[PDB]
A paper describes a structure:
Levansucrases (LSCs; EC 2.4.1.10) are members of glycosyl hydrolase family 68. They catalyse either the hydrolysis of sucrose into glucose and fructose or the transfructosylation of a variety of acceptor molecules, forming β-(2,6)-linked oligofructans. LSCs share the same reaction mechanism and their active sites have similar structural features: a triad of amino acids are involved in catalysis, namely two aspartates and one glutamate (Asp46, Asp203 and Glu287 in Erwinia tasmani­ensis [name] and the same residues in E. amylovora [name]). GH68 family members perform hydrolysis and transfructosylation through a double-displacement reaction.
Here, we report the crystal structure of [name] levansucrase (EtLsc) in complex with (S)-1,2,4-butanetriol, which was selected by the enzyme during crystallization from racemic 1,2,4-butanetriol. The structure of EtLsc in complex with (S)-1,2,4-butanetriol was solved to a resolution of 1.40 Å (space group P41212). The compound establishes hydrogen bonds via its OH groups to Asp46 Oδ2, which binds to C2-OH (2.53 Å), and Glu287 Oɛ1, which binds to C1-OH (2.81 Å). C4-OH of (S)-1,2,4-butanetriol forms hydrogen bonds to Trp45 Nɛ1 (2.73 Å) and His97 Nδ1 (2.75 Å). Despite the fact that the crystallization conditions included a mixture of the enantiomers (S)-1,2,4-butanetriol and (R)-1,2,4-butanetriol, the electron-density maps (Polder omit, F obs − F calc and 2F obs − F calc) show exclusively (S)-1,2,4-butanetriol. Therefore, EtLsc has a lower or no affinity for the ligand with the R configuration, as the different stereochemistry at C2 would prevent C2-OH from establishing a hydrogen bond to Asp46 Oδ2 and give rise to unfavourable interactions with the surrounding residues. The S configuration allows the compound to partially mimic the natural substrate, with C2-OH overlapping O5 of fructose, whereas the R enantiomer cannot overlap in a similar way in relation to O5. The resulting K d for (S)-1,2,4-butanetriol is 84.9 ± 13.4 mM. We compared the binding mode of (S)-1,2,4-butanetriol with the fructose binding mode in the available structures of bacterial GH68 members. In the Gram-negative GH68 members EaLsc and BiBftA, C1-OH, C2-OH and C4-OH of (S)-1,2,4-butanetriol overlap with C3-OH, O5 and C6-OH of fructose, respectively.
Author numbering: 4 to 415
């Protein structure tokens, strides 16, 4: 814990540029296909090992998704006229979230596998995002995820993957181990802020010290509205950009914890790697790419969680360091790595950067006819980026939901 968090400053955020074609997701076609007429998916968590390598098992690619039923024929989701209300159904998904798995030989055209956990296994009904880790070539998996309402608790659950020529089955995800919640000295609690953020574990091993760590989304500890914005949060802002309005209400951070040992059964919370006090309230789904001896730290954020007198698009932001604990500098100078285009600002969300440079996201809301929108709840086209020092470049795009493995694990 003998390091300082790196602020993502207001001065950095003032460089954020929407519609830079090197850092903008291609336009989603409003005629996109949907991967299921029975379920919505959104946050997508590819099966990975402790370095971030996407792994297939016996030639089967696997993804875990936040999932909810499409309530097409459910009277509870009809409007006053008795017509299915897709917008109300979709916007209610967070309260219905369950983790499901899908499989494919090809990394696309996903086959639905169903629930990871039987209903009742999760301490909370809501199963919010995290990371599935393939532990070994016997097929053992720890799904790290977030138990939400009551509270917000990082948890994990052990099970097994089994394969055949037909597909993949998950078994034995029966015992959820609660690992930790917000502490109130480093990370903000529900007591301090009814709207606190605490979620989205991403475990990794650092080969430099051999230890097991995890990233998560947090907020900087303190009673809502009381945070002091410091010069270090401001950065070198230009003349006329001193007015921060309500910026003390934006207190996002990328948290870090370290495990007592490689079992990951016991955790010590550490100071955050990145703080965004006075800049953005939500640094969601933090994740690493380890490339060319550097630590590329990515996080997803919203236009509407920026502080007053700052803005940027929905998308993935990022930072790079030579050392796990920093100091970090922002990717592309501003932090923006892949932003939605201004003509379709909500087209996708939950942009997840994999070490092969592929970026997956789910389709949210695309402009349709006049002032109307079409809802996705299905995978967006995969984008390829290159990382070159502290810059990134969009170079290609692929099919809807293309999430191939980087390597294949032969089960013993
Ligand atoms: Zn690996
Ligand atoms: Zn083995
Ligand atoms: Zn947004």
């Amino acid at each position: 814990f003998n390091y300082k968090p790196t602020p993502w400053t207001r001065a950095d955020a003032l460089k954020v540029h929407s519609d830079d074609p090197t850092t903008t997701q291609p336009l989603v076609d409003v005629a996109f296909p949907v991967m299921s007429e029975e379920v919505f998916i959104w946050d997508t968590m590819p099966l990975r090992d402790f370095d971030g390598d996407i792994v297939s098992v016996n030639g089967w690619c696997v993804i875990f998704t936040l999932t909810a039923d499409r309530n097409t024929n459910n009277p509870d989701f009809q409007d006053e006229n008795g017509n299915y209300d897709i917008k109300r159904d979709w916007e209610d998904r967070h309260g219905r979230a369950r983790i499901c798995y899908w499989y494919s030989r090809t990394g696309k055209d996903w086959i639905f596998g169903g629930r990871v956990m039987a209903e009742g296994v999760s301490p909370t009904t809501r199963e919010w995002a995290g990371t599935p880790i393939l532990l070994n070539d016997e097929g053992d998996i720890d799904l790290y995820y977030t138990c939400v309402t009551p509270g917000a608790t990082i948890a994990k659950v052990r099970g097994k993957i089994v394969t055949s020529d037909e597909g993949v089955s998950l078994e034995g995800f029966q015992h959820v181990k609660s690992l930790f919640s917000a502490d109130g000295k480093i990370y903000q609690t529900e007591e301090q802020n009814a709207y606190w953020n605490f979620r989205d574990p991403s475990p990794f091993i650092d080969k430099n010290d051999g230890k097991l760590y995890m990233l998560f989304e947090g907020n900087v500890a303190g009673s809502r509205g009381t945070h002091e914005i410091t010069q270090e949060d401001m950065g070198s802002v230009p003349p006329g950009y001193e007015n921060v309005g309500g910026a003390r209400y934006q207190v996002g951070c990328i948290g870090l914890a370290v495990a007592k040992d490689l079992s990951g059964d016991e955790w010590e919370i550490l100071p955050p790697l990145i703080t965004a006090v006075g800049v953005n309230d939500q640094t969601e789904r933090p994740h690493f790419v380890f490339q060319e001896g550097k630590y590329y730290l990515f996080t997803i954020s919203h236009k509407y969680t920026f502080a007053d007198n700052l803005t940027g698009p929905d998308g993935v932001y990022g930072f790079v360091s030579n050392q796990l604990t920093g100091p970090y500098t922002p990717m592309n100078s501003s932090g923006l790595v892949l932003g939605n285009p201004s003509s379709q600002p909500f087209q996708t969300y939950s942009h997840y950067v994999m070490p092969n440079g592929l970026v997956t996201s789910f389709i949210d809301s695309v402009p349709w006819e006049g002032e109307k929108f079409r809802i996705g709840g299905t995978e967006a086209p995969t984008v390829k980026i290159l990382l070159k020092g502290d810059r990134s470049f969009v170079v290609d795009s692929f099919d809807y939901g293309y999430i191939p493995a980087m390597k294949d694990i032969i089960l013993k």
